[PDB]
Symmetry: D3
Subunit: 130 residues, 6 copies
């Protein structure tokens, strides 16, 4: 039984897919543990969240995009939660997942889910320092 | 163009209807303006929110219920937003609405939506004092 | 005020693959299945009892003919005020939001029966669930 | 008996990605497609003919500019009582359960048009499918 | 050609209100119901017969106590390649797109059983529908 | 990497009322309709061109027969990497999550065609949209 961090990206709000995305996590029996609405995320928070990528050349376009609209940060709890929600997120190639059914751009891909126990602990501390 | 207050009640979490409910408001083109997750709402907040009802004999069962599980408080924005989201909420008698399609008890009815300009201003100040 | 009502999923439901869709609308309003029977063909006897009140109508035989034209499922549903709330779920072909309102388009081929009163329920339930 | 009626999927439907959602509700009510055309941009005179009863109203020009602001789909549907049944499906932005009731929140950007009468239906059909 | 297979809707499905959701996915894949029974409580020997290949495992008793903890529905489905197609629909809790992949998160509370072979299928069917 | 691909909604789609469901899956993956035509009956000519590569197969005539058995809609879709992504949406009757995976159950009656490569798209698009 784990906790993991999810961000619902601005494009979800654009395309009104917010509930669709959350619904898929709900219908798999994961529980909201805490949650925040950000009309525009503090760019500092975004930069930390993507620190890993600061050296990639796409980094700035990424931060620009993540701050160009609302986002929701969620802490989800459930059995094998990190691994499972990752699979649920999927990729824009494989049907059945969130990115597989709804997303279409390597950049505008609707959702973030932590990919490891370390990044999960880390990403939760970023959005939910308390 | 108005702002209104919505609560998603504990029974929504019980029955995993949270996204279903939010989805219906999203698909009608209303926008999240701000939002809070409460694993257990401060009973003080609940009592204020339902002050109007303190004289009714059902009052305490009501507060007990509203605090027996998570709730989400949302500020929604959109044309005629107060009136419309009210209609959307509906009642447990009329199909097509949230309560009409999903709820079934006069007490456990999934959602709250402000019913007037005054109560809307008031209810937003309660959950979102800033 | 807990109650019980009798529901028939009609042959057009199977024909058109709307069995899950119909039941799911009843399930989402928090009604519980209490008894259920699948009938590949319903005894013309049982049908005529079910629609005994209509025996003196022009449409009585085409009704029966149709009700035996394919499978049907009889369900006993249970929940607060079930008799009347499931009735509103069923609705009519004129009111969007209901089962007939969204999915049906014909006076006769209309997907679902639901008891219209307590007398009818107690009565209908007996027909389909003699036990 | 069988009627035919004319539907237009408006540009807001394409923008908001509700084209399948809309056609879906009509499909699930057991109505069939007889004719269908996709217009990346509907010609302005077609739009102006289609709304000709509206030609004197203040909103007339803005309406047409809107209906021309993006793609539209015109569809002839066939089904029992199609005209009235599909009018009802469309509903309005005050009626939960209908297309405009669940999905629309604007007097002008309301996703869909359907013929409102036997004659307006026959008329509207010849505009979008004159080759008959 | 046509096969028949046996499905069980488990008690977790009734608790979580996913009975229509589950049957729906099989219905949309074009499989037909031939037989169906609702059990408010399935008799324990039926459950124990149904899982008899499992009788030596540690989990055997807990499994049966679970399958008896609430209602279940048994269904015979008919369709082309039904056994394998419906096994695949069920999937597992690691495979998005399937019943267990989208809706389940427990090794035991996994909503649905379907026959996994021609023989297990014929066998399982006589257990729940012995009157044939 | 914007692309265009040709999609056919087959006669089983209409027969079974899955036209909106199919298109909606394409719409939700953010693909845009660029051209569209409804055909109450498709010219056996156009079909045979479309399936010219299969002309030497056992199934070639039943294929054609079926493709003319009811309406079809040809759609030109457009979006990043559309040719290949719509192909994965279409999937096969063995893989849940795809159109065929969820909705189809037959080698032949399988609801939808999508271009399998750029050559096929450019080629197919021409057949159905000569203009
Ligand atoms: C790898 C990669 C990422 N990105 C951007 C878009 C993504 O939203 C974000 C994160 O990408 P990445 O960390 O590779 O994937 P995930 O979202 O599964 O963690 O960085 C690109 O724009 N191009 C790329 O090649
Ligand atoms: C009127 C009423 C309310 N309640 C409880 C349940 C409801 O969640 C809450 C509010 O009821 P009310 O203010 O009447 O309706 P709304 O939710 O539309 O504002 O009070 C009862 O339990 N019984 C009653 O008769
Ligand atoms: C009234 C009527 C009913 N029927 C059929 C379909 C109905 O489900 C059944 C009884 O009709 P009715 O009492 O109108 O509907 P309900 O199912 O709501 O009781 O008989 C007709 O075929 N034609 C008719 O004119
Ligand atoms: C009344 C009205 C309609 N419209 C648009 C949206 C309507 O679909 C169309 C015709 O209006 P109207 O005839 O009132 O609505 P309906 O479409 O139900 O017949 O014109 C406006 O843009 N402004 C307006 O004030
Ligand atoms: C493996 C396993 C199964 N089960 C339950 C859930 C399974 O549906 C059933 C049989 O297990 P198994 O044969 O592994 O799964 P399947 O249902 O895919 O054949 O028993 C447990 O309760 N505990 C376990 O460790
Ligand atoms: C291979 C094959 C195809 N068909 C039909 C249905 C297929 O959609 C069409 C071409 O077959 P195929 O190339 O296998 O499928 P796809 O549609 O993915 O190209 O011909 C058969 O009826 N039987 C067969 O064995
Ligand atoms: Mg990553
Ligand atoms: Mg009130
Ligand atoms: Mg009646
Ligand atoms: Mg009008
Ligand atoms: Mg097995
Ligand atoms: Mg191929």
């Amino acid at each position: 039984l784990q906790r993991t961090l999810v961000l619902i990206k601005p494009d979800a709000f654009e395309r009104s897919l917010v509930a669709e995305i959350m619904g898929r996590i709900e219908k798999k029996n994961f529980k909201i543990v805490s949650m925040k609405f950000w009309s525009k995320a503090p760019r500092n928070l975004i930069e930390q969240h993507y620190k890993e990528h600061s050296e990639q050349s796409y980094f700035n376009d990424l931060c620009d995009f993540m701050v160009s609209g609302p986002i929701i940060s969620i802490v989800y709890e459930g059995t094998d939660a990190i691994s499972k929600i990752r699979r649920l997120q999927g990729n824009i190639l494989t049907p059945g997942t969130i990115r597989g059914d709804l997303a279409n751009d390597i950049g505008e891909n609707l959702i973030h889910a932590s990919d490891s126990e370390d990044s999960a602990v880390d990403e939760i501390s970023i959005w939910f320092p308390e």
